[PDB]
Design a protein around this ligand. Structure first.
Ligand SMILES: Cc1nnc2ccc(N3CCC(C(=O)NCCCN4CCN(c5cccc(Cl)c5)CC4)CC3)nn12
Length: 125
């Protein structure tokens, strides 16, 4: 099976704005995660064809990745900083749903999540 289409990253019919918190999420939170040694499996959508994960999209129905998150932040897709935070937590959660405890991939997610939460705890008002 092919992969599914990637999540939406721009919508004409969705209102759009810029916030202080949305800047921190891009300029601080995404940047820091993006440069982490274990960030690479999360920088684009799960390619089940390339990675030979034939059931990935049978089990995961709400895919998300940092690649999408970046695009969404750059095209002003988000209205609320809460929407963006939900996207990160979806990404992490999918990992933990699909994979077993201790698989390499889970350890790489858990390392990034630790860092995510550290940065989210210093989000501005
Ligand atoms: C995204 C995503 N969601 N589910 C999956 C399943 C596989 C998958 N890939 C992409 C990455 C592949 C993988 O696990 N590669 C890891 C390389 C091996 N390293 C081994 C050592 N390592 C590591 C990471 C965290 C803690 C510790 Cl101690 C060592 C870093 C990772 C397996 C195939 N991506 N994925």
């Amino acid at each position: 099976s092919m992969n599914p289409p990637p999540p939406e990253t721009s919508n004409p019919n969705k209102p759009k704005r810029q916030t202080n918190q949305l800047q921190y999420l891009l300029r601080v939170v995404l940047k820091t995660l993006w440069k982490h040694q274990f960030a690479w499996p999360f920088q684009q959508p799960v390619d089940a064809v390339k990675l030979n994960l034939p059931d990935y999209y049978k089990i995961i129905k709400t895919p998300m990745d940092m690649g999408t998150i970046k695009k969404r932040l750059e095209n002003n897709y988000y209205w609320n900083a809460q929407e963006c935070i939900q996207d990160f937590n979806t990404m992490f959660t999918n990992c933990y749903i699909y994979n077993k405890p201790g698989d390499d991939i889970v350890l790489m997610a858990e390392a990034l999540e630790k860092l995510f939460l550290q940065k989210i705890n210093e989000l501005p008002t």
